[model samples]
Target: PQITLWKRPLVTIKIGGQLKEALLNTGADDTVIEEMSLPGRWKPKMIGGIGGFIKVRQYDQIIIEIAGHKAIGTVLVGPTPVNIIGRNLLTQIGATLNF
Candidate 1:
């Protein structure tokens, strides 16, 4: 389905069986979650963006449900201002941007 780009394209997503709202960010390459308690054997890494650098836990092969569509991939857990559903997951559900 088509979604407009404005303040943000927010959607309902379930991560680890927990429901949460996430922003569909076309600009981001990977999905990022704000919850630090996500269970997994993750690798510690540093990531950068417009806000600068921060450490994160990268968990591979994660399952998430977006708009009732299941998307299985890597999920990065960290301290973020907001939860984001990036392009990697967006394409899985055939989400498109309509200007």
Candidate 2:
């Protein structure tokens, strides 16, 4: 879907076979989600924002569902303020900004 930047581009996504709502933030380098339990081993990694960076667990080959679109990629689980759908998964869902 073509989304405008008038408001937060929040969308529903499915991860870990559960339903979740996440923001479509194209600016983010990777996808970040609130702390949650998922199957498989993850590596300790740090993700940086504007001010600083935080250590997050990186899980690979994650299948995320966005509005019926299945997106497969790496997802970071950490203490993020909200769930974010970044370019990694956004590209799979073919999300584009159209002003």
Candidate 3:
């Protein structure tokens, strides 16, 4: 059997006074926000995962809008330095990536 997958257009967000775009990847198991895009004072901490240690930081609440839908959530900022829209937010709107 073959698995079918969909890819959605990259979502744009404003962080640390700059606008950044990220691919909305519902296939991701966890929500990943960009650490570099966050403000300096946010002070994010590292989090561990099955792959070993993954940098996990916390945001109080972030204003995120996807495809004209908006919501606020305490997003987990990753240290990878790139913005990512993961499954956590996707589940809220019953949305999936479409390409």
Q: What is the C-alpha lDDT profile of model 2 across 12-72, one tens digit per residue?
A: 8999978999998889989999999888989999999787998899999998898789989
> Per-candidate RMSD vs. true structure?
1.5, 1.1, 5.3
Candidate 3: tens digits of C-alpha lDDT, residues 1-99: 122545545767654455678766655655576654554335556655446667677775666775556766656777644566777776765674344
lDDT of each: 0.85, 0.89, 0.61
Clashing pairs in 1: none
Minimum summed lDDT over a 10-residue window in model 2 is located at 90-99
The full ranking of all candidates by TM-score, starting with the best, is 2, 1, 3
Flag regions of model 2 displaced more than 4 Å: none
Candidate 3 regions off by >4 Å? Answer: 1-9, 15-17, 36-52, 97-99
Q: What TM-score does candidate 1 reach? A: 0.89
